Write a protein that binds this ligand. Structure first.
Ligand SMILES: *C(=O)C[C@@H](NC(=O)OCC(C)C)c1ccccc1
Ligand SMILES: [Cl-]
Ligand SMILES: [Cl-]
Ligand SMILES: [Cl-]
Length: 178
């Protein structure tokens, strides 16, 4: 079964998605979005909590599916701490890049998922003996979803923020395979 970080993230995303149905998207964004006013710059959960919001069924379904599989594998073979750090860093950097180019109204686990995909892929590529790797079939489906995002075949975050997410995963896999 999915480990505690994999699980709690899934739940938290579900709980937040429910809140968005009941209260509407904007009202939840009011509490969880990246600081959108200087008077909010010190509400520190906001530098992370944007990752918890999703805006359509597809968004959350595909995000949580990749999270469950990639995040769950990383947690199981490499431990909870590893997943936590990949998540915190990719969420911060992809959120940063996203707000820089398009403002603070966005959300979702996509940055985090790009990181995990980059992490699992490069890790297996550079260091089979780790046990971690991204199957050929999954590389293909990952590539297809990356293309969908690149050429807009409607998503919260832009290409840049997804790249920022990927860079974190590649960076960490690179570090680890030394
Ligand atoms: C974030 O990138 C939103 C995408 N997520 C997607 O499925 O990417 C998966 C790749 C493995 C990175 C999305 C998907 C469906 C609907 C909306 C947004
Ligand atoms: Cl499970
Ligand atoms: Cl997105
Ligand atoms: Cl390791």
């Amino acid at each position: 079964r999915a480990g505690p970080v994999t699980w709690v993230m899934m739940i938290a995303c579900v709980v937040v998605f429910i809140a968005m149905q009941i209260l509407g998207d904007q009202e939840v964004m009011l509490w969880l979005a990246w600081p959108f006013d200087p008077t909010l710059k010190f509400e520190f959960w906001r530098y992370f909590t944007h990752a918890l919001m999703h805006f359509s069924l597809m968004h959350i379904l595909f995000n949580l599916l990749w999270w469950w599989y990639l995040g769950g594998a990383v947690e199981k073979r490499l431990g909870s701490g590893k997943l936590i750090v990949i998540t915190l860093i990719s969420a911060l950097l992809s959120g940063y890049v996203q707000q820089k180019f398009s403002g603070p109204w966005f959300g979702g686990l996509s940055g985090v998922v790009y990181a995990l995909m980059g992490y699992v892929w490069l890790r297996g590529e550079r260091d089979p003996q780790s046990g971690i790797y991204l199957q050929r079939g999954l590389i293909i489906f990952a590539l297809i979803w990356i293309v969908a995002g690149w050429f807009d075949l409607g998503m919260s975050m832009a290409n840049g923020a997804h790249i920022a997410g990927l860079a974190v995963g590649l960076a960490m896999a690179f570090v680890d395979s030394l």
